[PDB]
Each structure stands twice: as C-alpha cells, then as structure tokens.
Amino acid sequence: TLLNSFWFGVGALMQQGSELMPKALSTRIVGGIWWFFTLIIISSYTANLA
Amino acid sequence: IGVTSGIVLVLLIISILVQVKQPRKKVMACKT
Numbered sequence: 034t035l036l037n038s039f040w041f042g043v044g045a046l047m048q049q050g051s052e053l054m055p056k057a058l059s060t061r062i063v064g065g066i067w068w069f070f071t072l073i074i075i076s077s078y079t080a081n082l083a
Numbered sequence: 084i085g086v087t088s089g090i091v092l093v094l095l096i097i098s099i100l101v102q103v104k105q106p107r108k109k110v111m112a113c114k115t
C-alpha cells in the first residue's frame with residue numbers, strides 16, 4: 034500500500050527496517066539501492082558528527 | 084529545488100490515483 038511503501042523508505046532510513054520485503058526483481062532494485070543510499074547517509078552523518 | 088520538488092509532487096498525485104481507484108485485494112494482476 035502507500036503506508037507500506039512510505040514506512041519502507043522511513044524504516045530503511047532510520048536503520049530499523051519494516052516488514053515489507055520486496056519479492057519481484059523490479060522492487061528489489063528499488064529497495065536494494067535505497068539500502069545503499071541510507072547506508073552512506075548514516076555513515077557520513079555519524080562520521081561528521083564526531 | 085524547483086524541478087525535483089515537482090517530480091515528487093507528480094509522483095504523489097499518481098500514488099493517490101493508484102491507491103484510491105485501484106484496491107489491493109480482489110483480482111488485479113498487472114494492474115497499473
């Protein structure tokens with residue numbers, strides 16, 4: 034749904050994650066590149082915050 | 084900020100249109 038899609042993007046941003054696991058290959062590339070996006074954002078945040 | 088705040092806005096008008104007009108349950112394979 035649109036709740037299920039929005040708190041995937043919020044869930045993978047605050048490193049906790051939601052249930053909502055993509056199953057098609059077309060949505061494991063959107064989900065798989067939002068995980069690499071929010072891995073670099075958090076790692077650059079917590080390195081500059083030092 | 085002038086374009087990409089409108090790209091998100093166009094994606095949000097479509098996402099309401101898919102949510103309201105199309106439900107999630109009965110028989111809707113390949114639908115939109």
Ligand SMILES: CCCCCCCC/C=C/CCCCCCCC(=O)O[C@@H](COC(=O)CCCCCCCCCCCCCCC)COP(=O)([O-])OCC[N+](C)(C)C
Pocket residue numbers: 034035036039098099102103106107
């Ligand atoms: C601070 C928080 C902000 C985040 C909010 C973001 C996402 C929030 C929105 C999430 C969308 C909700 C999806 C509902 C789940 C689908 C289930 C369904 O089909 O029944 C739904 C029917 O009603 C609808 O069709 C839903 C339409 C909601 C308006 C569209 C989003 C508005 C975006 C504007 C804001 C977005 C801007 C975001 C800005 C950041 C639910 O109805 P029901 O009462 O459960 O009863 C079932 C009725 N039935 C039997 C006929 C089915």
Ligand SMILES: CCCCCCCC/C=C\CCCCCCCC(=O)O[C@@H](COC(=O)CCCCCCCCCCCCCCC)COP(=O)([O-])OCC[N+](C)(C)C
Pocket residue numbers: 058061062065066069072
């Ligand atoms: C460690 C934690 C994260 C681990 C991730 C490791 C992954 C590997 C990551 C990188 C491997 C590639 C090597 C790059 C290093 C050399 C530099 C380089 O050439 O960069 C080049 C670009 O290259 C890129 O931008 C690579 C980005 C790939 C992202 C992969 C996401 C995986 C998601 C999976 C989703 C699938 C889901 C599957 C579903 C079934 C160009 O850069 P440059 O020219 O050198 O300098 C800039 C100069 N310039 C601005 C003019 C261009």
